[PDB]
XYZ file of C-alpha atoms in Angstrom:
244
model
C 5.714 29.773 -48.634
C 3.665 31.413 -51.355
C 2.797 34.898 -52.648
C -0.015 36.881 -51.024
C -3.252 36.482 -52.968
C -2.321 32.907 -53.867
C -4.825 30.260 -54.892
C -3.581 26.903 -53.548
C -4.846 23.752 -55.250
C -5.191 20.589 -53.159
C -5.319 17.211 -54.909
C -5.331 13.684 -53.559
C -2.506 11.531 -54.900
C -3.675 8.570 -56.990
C -7.164 9.968 -57.607
C -7.831 8.325 -60.046
C -4.159 7.487 -60.608
C -0.715 9.009 -60.113
C -0.546 9.796 -63.816
C -3.734 11.808 -63.854
C -2.618 13.517 -60.661
C 0.524 14.692 -62.428
C -1.536 15.912 -65.387
C -3.862 17.893 -63.102
C -0.930 19.511 -61.296
C 0.747 20.542 -64.558
C -2.562 21.904 -65.810
C -3.266 24.024 -62.711
C 0.294 25.137 -62.065
C -0.100 28.411 -63.997
C -2.807 29.515 -61.542
C -1.163 28.193 -58.387
C 0.919 30.045 -55.833
C 1.521 26.725 -54.111
C 0.164 23.185 -54.160
C -1.084 20.743 -51.508
C -0.697 17.066 -52.392
C -2.640 14.688 -50.191
C -1.590 11.167 -49.327
C -4.618 8.878 -49.157
C -5.161 7.170 -45.789
C -7.576 4.445 -44.666
C -9.000 6.526 -41.810
C -9.245 10.169 -43.018
C -11.400 11.173 -40.040
C -10.345 14.814 -40.233
C -11.542 15.391 -43.798
C -14.922 16.370 -45.146
C -17.065 14.011 -47.238
C -15.654 15.035 -50.624
C -12.002 14.591 -49.698
C -12.739 11.422 -47.742
C -14.094 9.742 -50.884
C -11.050 10.740 -52.943
C -8.980 8.918 -50.310
C -11.129 5.820 -50.768
C -10.903 6.029 -54.577
C -7.129 6.476 -54.604
C -6.673 3.534 -52.256
C -9.156 1.302 -54.105
C -7.211 1.861 -57.335
C -4.293 0.616 -55.292
C -2.280 3.713 -54.413
C 0.939 3.240 -52.461
C 2.712 5.787 -50.255
C 5.871 6.426 -52.284
C 3.794 6.833 -55.426
C 3.497 10.403 -54.083
C 7.210 11.114 -54.475
C 6.928 9.974 -58.075
C 4.278 12.636 -58.687
C 6.419 15.325 -57.054
C 9.714 14.319 -58.695
C 8.096 14.293 -62.148
C 6.292 17.561 -61.447
C 9.620 19.077 -60.415
C 11.073 18.390 -63.851
C 8.630 21.043 -65.074
C 7.820 23.354 -62.144
C 9.383 24.874 -59.036
C 6.018 25.794 -57.475
C 6.105 25.220 -53.713
C 4.708 21.824 -52.805
C 3.210 20.883 -49.458
C 2.606 17.227 -48.668
C -0.490 16.593 -46.525
C -0.741 13.312 -44.590
C -1.909 11.472 -41.505
C 0.704 10.523 -38.922
C 0.248 6.741 -39.199
C 1.945 6.374 -42.640
C 4.931 8.424 -41.461
C 5.321 6.948 -37.983
C 5.223 3.473 -39.511
C 7.640 4.430 -42.285
C 10.179 6.221 -40.083
C 9.805 9.978 -39.591
C 13.265 11.241 -40.565
C 13.424 8.689 -43.393
C 10.134 9.905 -44.835
C 11.026 13.590 -44.502
C 14.407 12.947 -46.150
C 12.902 11.040 -49.076
C 10.235 13.734 -49.483
C 12.959 16.391 -49.481
C 14.766 14.519 -52.264
C 11.570 14.158 -54.294
C 11.278 17.947 -54.171
C 8.805 18.563 -51.342
C 9.178 21.922 -49.559
C 6.833 21.538 -46.599
C 4.725 19.025 -44.737
C 1.385 18.993 -42.977
C 0.577 16.137 -40.590
C -3.147 16.406 -39.849
C -3.090 14.370 -36.625
C 0.415 14.953 -35.227
C 0.347 14.002 -31.520
C 1.263 17.042 -29.421
C 3.477 14.552 -27.561
C 5.568 14.410 -30.745
C 5.180 17.908 -32.197
C 8.560 19.222 -30.961
C 10.695 16.292 -32.111
C 8.850 16.341 -35.416
C 9.501 20.048 -36.029
C 13.204 19.642 -35.234
C 13.709 16.612 -37.494
C 11.857 18.515 -40.224
C 14.225 21.454 -39.801
C 17.249 19.136 -39.968
C 15.878 17.521 -43.144
C 15.068 20.835 -44.810
C 11.282 20.536 -44.747
C 9.129 23.481 -43.677
C 6.262 22.757 -41.298
C 2.582 23.472 -41.719
C 0.155 23.267 -38.805
C -3.601 23.171 -38.768
C -6.076 25.102 -36.641
C -9.859 24.811 -36.555
C -12.669 27.146 -35.417
C -12.271 25.616 -31.961
C -8.563 26.435 -31.657
C -8.136 29.107 -28.940
C -5.845 32.145 -28.970
C -3.219 30.423 -26.788
C -2.995 27.394 -29.068
C -2.725 29.594 -32.155
C 0.317 31.226 -30.643
C 1.993 27.896 -29.935
C 1.093 26.738 -33.434
C 2.493 29.891 -35.061
C 5.729 29.498 -33.064
C 6.428 25.954 -34.402
C 5.308 26.790 -37.928
C 8.048 27.430 -40.473
C 5.967 27.094 -43.662
C 2.540 28.559 -42.963
C -0.500 28.168 -40.747
C -3.417 26.352 -42.400
C -6.907 27.238 -41.220
C -9.763 24.853 -41.887
C -13.494 24.691 -41.421
C -15.250 21.324 -41.271
C -18.579 23.181 -41.362
C -18.726 23.154 -45.145
C -21.173 25.804 -46.364
C -23.356 27.967 -49.787
C -21.823 30.640 -47.572
C -18.620 30.709 -45.551
C -19.672 30.273 -41.903
C -19.169 33.147 -39.444
C -17.199 30.756 -37.281
C -14.679 30.393 -40.135
C -14.318 34.160 -40.665
C -13.913 34.472 -36.906
C -11.034 31.974 -37.008
C -9.277 33.926 -39.804
C -9.755 37.194 -37.932
C -8.318 35.695 -34.727
C -5.462 34.020 -36.621
C -4.479 37.345 -38.194
C -4.160 39.219 -34.900
C -1.783 36.508 -33.715
C 0.142 34.839 -36.533
C 3.449 36.148 -37.835
C 3.546 33.303 -40.358
C 1.356 33.585 -43.442
C -2.019 31.878 -43.272
C -3.919 29.989 -45.965
C -7.557 28.973 -45.636
C -9.348 25.717 -46.419
C -12.991 26.638 -45.870
C -14.500 24.739 -48.798
C -14.763 27.651 -51.212
C -16.748 27.141 -54.390
C -17.684 30.611 -55.625
C -15.754 33.665 -56.827
C -17.187 35.746 -53.970
C -15.634 33.255 -51.510
C -12.148 33.846 -52.907
C -12.595 37.630 -53.089
C -13.998 37.794 -49.576
C -11.454 35.562 -47.856
C -8.533 37.360 -49.520
C -10.007 40.711 -48.564
C -10.415 39.497 -44.989
C -6.718 38.750 -44.525
C -6.128 35.308 -46.003
C -2.624 35.255 -47.503
C -3.698 32.344 -49.676
C -6.868 30.395 -50.414
C -6.753 26.618 -50.701
C -9.032 25.003 -53.274
C -9.577 21.297 -52.717
C -13.174 20.116 -52.386
C -14.250 22.036 -55.468
C -11.498 20.333 -57.475
C -11.817 16.863 -55.946
C -15.548 16.972 -56.597
C -14.850 17.407 -60.315
C -12.136 14.734 -60.301
C -14.404 12.123 -58.727
C -16.905 13.006 -61.415
C -14.744 13.239 -64.561
C -11.926 10.836 -63.686
C -8.881 11.188 -65.957
C -10.778 13.659 -68.140
C -11.203 16.196 -65.337
C -8.303 18.391 -66.497
C -10.018 21.102 -68.562
C -12.932 21.205 -66.126
C -10.515 21.930 -63.299
C -8.983 24.769 -65.332
C -12.409 26.377 -65.722
C -13.355 26.046 -62.053
C -10.033 27.661 -61.085
C -10.512 30.451 -63.629
C -14.035 31.033 -62.334
C -12.724 31.212 -58.768
C -10.076 33.606 -60.040
C -12.491 35.760 -61.989
C -10.732 35.027 -65.295
């Protein structure tokens, strides 16, 4: 869904507010090959400490689901950079799958990632997504075996997203091992969310086969620290990670 060598920012919607989120996106767009926009959820059990707290912040400040389409729609007025919406199933199941996908498609979303999509629903989800024009993005962790990777790659229309809960400040062997394994199997492009935070992390991961590197924790850390004034700080962190 993005160019090879891409840096892919991840931001939580409504952290600290939908307005600041828009500002951050517009500020990082020039460095982004694609963008992941996260929908805060009450029980973000799949996320690491940093991202979990951004979910809490966003919600505390009173974020509401569709406030995410506002961010996208507005962003679209300025950019055409691919946008991937990341969410938990709950919000979508409760709000009607097809209805959500359709609305997202209208707001300008290109692909969706449902962190905890029940395998029991995977198929129907992928089909509805295809009918609504939304590309799919599936996750795989260090404990995802070769056989599951294949099945994941086969249902993926957007790209395969590899993560590492591990954190770091070096990238764990187990994470490199996952990338390596994913490359010998996936036909789709793969992006990695391994909690990078240093230029060597970006250089290394790209060199090792990552089509794109996601950058979330490093950005969300700054945002929870600088609030609405995090903009320029984000630009510098991204430039540092880019070597510019």
